[PDB]
Amino acid sequence: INCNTSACTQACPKVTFEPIPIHYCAPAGYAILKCNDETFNGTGPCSNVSTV
Amino acid sequence: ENLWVTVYYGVPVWKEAKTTLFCASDARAYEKEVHNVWATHACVPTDPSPQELVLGNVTENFNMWKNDMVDQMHEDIISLWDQSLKPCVKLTPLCVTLICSDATVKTGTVEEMKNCSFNTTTEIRDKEKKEYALFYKPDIVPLSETNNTSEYRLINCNTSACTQACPKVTFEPIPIHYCAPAGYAILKCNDETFNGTGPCSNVSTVQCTHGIRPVVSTQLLLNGSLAEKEIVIRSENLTNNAKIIIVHLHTPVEIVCTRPNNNTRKSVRIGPGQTFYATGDIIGDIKQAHCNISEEKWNDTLQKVGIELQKHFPNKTIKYNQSAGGDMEITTHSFNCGGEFFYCNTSNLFNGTYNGTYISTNSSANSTSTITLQCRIKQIINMWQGVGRCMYAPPIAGNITCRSNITGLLLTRDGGTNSNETETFRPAGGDMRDNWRSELYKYKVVKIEPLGVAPTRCKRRV
Amino acid sequence: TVKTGTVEEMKNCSFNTTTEIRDKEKKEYALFYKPDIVPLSETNNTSEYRL
Amino acid sequence: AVGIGAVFLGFLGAAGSTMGAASMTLTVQARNLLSGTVWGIKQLQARVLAVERYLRDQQLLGIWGCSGKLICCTNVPWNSSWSNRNLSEIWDNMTWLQWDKEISNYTQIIYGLLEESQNQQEKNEQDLLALD
Amino acid sequence: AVGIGAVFLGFLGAAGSTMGAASMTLTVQARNLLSGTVWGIKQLQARVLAVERYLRDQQLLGIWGCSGKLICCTNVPWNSSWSNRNLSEIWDNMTWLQWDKEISNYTQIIYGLLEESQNQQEKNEQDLLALD
Amino acid sequence: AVGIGAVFLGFLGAAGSTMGAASMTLTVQARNLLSGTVWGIKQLQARVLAVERYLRDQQLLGIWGCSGKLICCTNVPWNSSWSNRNLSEIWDNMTWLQWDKEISNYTQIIYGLLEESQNQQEKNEQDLLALD
Known part of the structure; x- marks a missing residue:
């Protein structure tokens, strides 16, 4: 399929495709805040907030 | 009447030093052109406004032909030319035998361009295709081991493989400002008819340099x-x-x-x-x-x-x-x-x-x-x-x-x-260097040395 | 063999190397040591070798 | 005219005003000694140069005293070999850059004396608190 | 409450306790303002961001006074144009975050007054030691 | 001894001179805790390791007090569980490294008490200057 657009590399069969969980952190001097209110529609205030 | 020594921090004195300056583009060509312009993609976008000092009684020696700032600019231009040619085409497949004659475009001769025909490789490795293009002279050299026939090759086949410049990339001298890091300062002359060496009785500080153009x-x-x-x-x-x-x-x-x-x-x-x-x-x-x-x-x-x-x-x-x-x-x-x-x-x-x-x-x-x-x-x-x-x-x-x-x-x-x-x-x-030395003639880089010692005739109560 | 006799360790290998021009191949030689040289994959005991 | 917002808040603008007057402005210059893909090295090593340079000066002022005040009397008397000028000459005629050319001599000898005298003071303060 | 060690367990745990009570636990938050192949840039520039941020705040406190103490009164009068509230309102009702919304005005003017008043103080101390 | 520079100019020269004599030479080791293409990570991360480690120790001394004098009395009395020795034993017989191997216990408990007592002192100074 790809001969007319690019050259595809074979994925290294030793490499594994699995969603191992990832935690994101902020550097020193910053903080991560998260909501706790239920049925949060994605915008607006959260009356119960936590640092992590 | 015993005399006691004292120490001051943040005093205005300096000494020359070879630091690493940086860029500080004009911050107007940083739309999509940021990745397009040659010799600007690595620059930080900033707004380096001037400074009006004019220090006063300073008398600073300047030199242009022993400057190192121009050599850092030269190294930057070299290393940032290579960086832009990395991600696009190598013309190794073009290093073939070219069967070429005079172009003779529409019943008339053109003296400068040869109409070359060569077997190019298609996307499929097996099948080659006959293709042509009008190559200039200089780019074309007669091929060896033939009896003066119409067989030619590209100029560089016997020394290296040339990469095609990425056609999205633009060759334009967008102005470049050079800035010294924190703890250093850039000095510049103001006397007229400066012959490149000797003192400048009117000297100034600036956060960054004038908008030098990387013309070559x-x-x-x-x-x-x-x-x-x-x-x-x-x-x-x-x-x-x-x-x-x-x-x-x-x-x-x-x-x-x-x-x-x-x-x-x-x-x-x-x-x-x-x-x-x-x-x-x-x-x-x-x-x-x-x-x-x-x-x-x-x-x-x-x-x-x-x-x-x-x-x-x-x-x-x-x-x-x-x-x-x-x-x-x-x-x-x-x-x-x-x-x-x-x-x-x-x-x-x-x-x-x-x-x-x-x-x-x-x-x-x-x-x-x-x-x-x-x-x-x-x-x-x-x-x-x-x-x-x-x-x-x-x-x-x-x-x-x-x-x-x-x-x-x-x-x-x-x-x-x-x-x-x-x-x-x-x-x-x-x-x-001579093309860029002619605009860095004003400037000089100095390391601030803010720690000093002096007498005051007064003791620290203890 | 060198002028009448044979060096016991080295082989006078010959191979078709590519020139600068992609179309033209040139026949070339060089004295490779043994250890560096192995008989070719699945041939009838001929004098064909590979690195 | 022009004012302090250039005249020292740019940089170094007391470089020719003599140390009698240049010593008044010290703070706004001290304020500016810190504010700092292979080209990422041209930014990281530019950042780290400013940071280490700054700390290697605060290191000495904490060792000499008194500590981070920007002006300190040190209780270290002048050796005779250093005595070249009268105090009226220095603070009223010369510039800080000009004065650096003369006092750069003996400089590495001063810093040892300042360092040593601080240990004596700190030990003595412990003695006073112990006796008190 | 909750012990003071957990009142800023990582940070900010007194963010809603009013500045009368939040100012009593500053150290348990101040301690954590510093503790910091192309992904090596994602660690180095994360480290250097913390270091330069920290020093660029310690730089100001060494200039304003008194020097680094976590609380300093500054001998700079609270100008009338900044005077919007009585002290009973501030320290007993408003959180630090809420107060930041009001006092963020005039902020860059305060830092100049704090900086210059230190030079006058240090010069005065030089005068006192000379006269004494 | 011998001059302190000759003993101690490199590093650690008083590592076996008992705690009494080792406490006189502190500065010249304190001065040496801060000094300084993809292969260059062995320079950048070597630089940044020294800088962050240095600040992360100066952070504590500013929180405990008093502040960065290199010797501080803390006004925090010894809890009974820490009591091990008479003072004549420690300073006249034990080396600093030997003493570290004993008092390495309790260590993280001390730092909290030093941090808390500083807030009490600073609050008291606010009270005194307000009442005065």
């Missing part, structure tokens, strides 16, 4: 900044004939360059998804690439250079002469106007000797004559005399025009014992 040419600097009071002639040692003579001008002469013919542009598919752009046809008539300069303005700008250059060479008529012969890169004036790399023959621009009296005949009479140079063009250019740094400039459809203010001449002096009444000044240059 030879035998005529162009699009540069101009002097303030008079033509300034600048050389490390005028008594040594090996030194370039940066003849910085006050008034700019204007040069107009063009390529009249209406080139097309065709793409040759090679390998998995790569393409190679080359000229396909010239849909029009045939031309001469040329550059135009006013004859009156050039007479004025050589008369005044004669006057200013006669001060250091008193009691002498001043004679100009053509270059000393060699390849196109050495003898001819280079450009990258509009993306095409011209190579203009500067004879008879620098021709004739102007009498020591310098009778300035510029007056009400009309002298609209223009001196017209004639220029070759290349595509496969070995940059900065590095054969491993070669690249292939893609063709550009349509005819080109390129206005430009000029100059500061890059002259060199010549003459034996025989003449001794007039000295022969030839065009010179082609080295990299």
Whole structure:
């Protein structure tokens, strides 16, 4: 399929495709805040907030 | 009356140092062009406004030919030219046998371009395809081990493989500001007619440098900044004939360059998804690439250079002469106007000797004559005399025009014992640093040393 | 063999190397040591070798 | 005119006003000694140069005293070999840059004396608190 | 409450306790303002961001006074144009975050007054030691 | 001894001289805790390791007090569980490294008490200057 657009590399069969969980952190001097209110529609205030 | 020593922090003293300066672009060309512009993609976008000091009683020594800032700029230009050519096409598949004859476009001969035909590889490895393109001369060399037949090859096949310049990338001198890191400061002169060394009685600090342009040419600097009071002639040692003579001008002469013919542009598919752009046809008539300069303005700008250059060479008529012969890169004036790399023959621009009296005949009479140079063009250019740094400039459809203010001449002096009444000044240059040294002549970098010791005749109660 | 006799360790290998031009191949030689040289994959005991 | 917002808040603008007057402005220059893909090295090493340079000066002022005040009397008397000028000459005529050319001599000898005298003071303060 | 060690367990745990009570636990938050192949840039520039941020705040406190103490009164009068509230309102009702919304005005003017008043104080201390 | 520079100019020269004599040479080791293409990570991360480690120790001394004098009395009395020795034993017989191997216990408990007592002191100074 790809001969007319690019050259595809074979994925290294030793490499594994699995969603191992990832935690994101902020550097020193910053903080991560998260909501706790239920049925949060994605915008607006959260009356119960936590640092992590 | 015992005397006690004291210490102060944050005092204004400094010493020279070779730090790493940075950039600090103009922050106006940082739309999508940030990834397009050559020699700007790595720069930080900032707004380096000037500073109005003018320190007062400072008397700082400056030097231009021992400066290291220009060498850091040179290293940056080298390493950022390579960085832009990495992610696109290598022309190794083009290094084949080219069966080429004169183009003979539409019943008529064109002297400069060969119509080459070669077997290119399609996307599928098995099947080759016969393809053609109009290659210039210089780019093309006769092939070895044949009886003077019509078999040719590219210039660089026997030394290196040239990468096609990424056609999205743009060759334009977008201005560059250089800034010293924190803890250092940039000093600059303000005295007029600074000959490149010695004290400057009027000195200033700045967060970053003036908007230097990374133009590269030879035998005529162009699009540069101009002097303030008079033509300034600048050389490390005028008594040594090996030194370039940066003849910085006050008034700019204007040069107009063009390529009249209406080139097309065709793409040759090679390998998995790569393409190679080359000229396909010239849909029009045939031309001469040329550059135009006013004859009156050039007479004025050589008369005044004669006057200013006669001060250091008193009691002498001043004679100009053509270059000393060699390849196109050495003898001819280079450009990258509009993306095409011209190579203009500067004879008879620098021709004739102007009498020591310098009778300035510029007056009400009309002298609209223009001196017209004639220029070759290349595509496969070995940059900065590095054969491993070669690249292939893609063709550009349509005819080109390129206005430009000029100059500061890059002259060199010549003459034996025989003449001794007039000295022969030839065009010179082609080295990299001299084009950028002529705009970093003001600036100097100093390390602040904020810790100091002094007496006060007073003790710390304890 | 060198002028009458044979060096016991080295082989006078010959091979078709590519020139700078992709189309043209040139016949070339060089004295490779043994250890560096192995008989070719699945041939009838001929004098064909590979690195 | 122009004012302090350039005249020192740019940089160094008391460089020719003599140390009698240049010593008044010290703070706004001290404020500016810190504010700092292979080109990422041209930014990281530019950042780290400023940070280490700054700390290597605060290191000395904490060792000499008194500690971070920007002006300190040190209780270290002048050796005779250093005595070249009268105090009226220095603070009223010379500049800080000019004065650096003379006092750069003996400089590495001063810093040892300042360092040593601080240990004596700190030990003595412990003695006073112990006796008190 | 909750012990003071957990009142700023990582940070900010007194963010809603009013500045009368939040100012009593500053150290348990101040301690954590510093503790910091192309992904090596994602660690180095994360480290250097913390270091330069920290020093660029310690730089100001060493200039204003008194020097680094976590609480300093500054001998700079609270100008009338900044005077919007009585002290009973501030320290007993408003959180630090809420107060930042009001006092963020005039902020860059305060830092100049704090900086310059230190030079006057240090010069005065030089005068006192000279006269004493 | 011998001059302190000759003993101690490199590093650690008093590592076996008992705690009494080792406490005189502190500065010249304190001065040496801060000094200084993809292969260059062995320089950048070597630089940044020294800088962050240095600040992360100066952070504590500013929180405990008093502040960065290199010797501080803390006004925090010894809890009974820490009591091990008489003072004549420690300073006259034990080396600093030997003493570290004993008092390495309890260590993280001390730092909290030092941090808390500083807030009490600073609050008291606010009270005194307000009442005064």
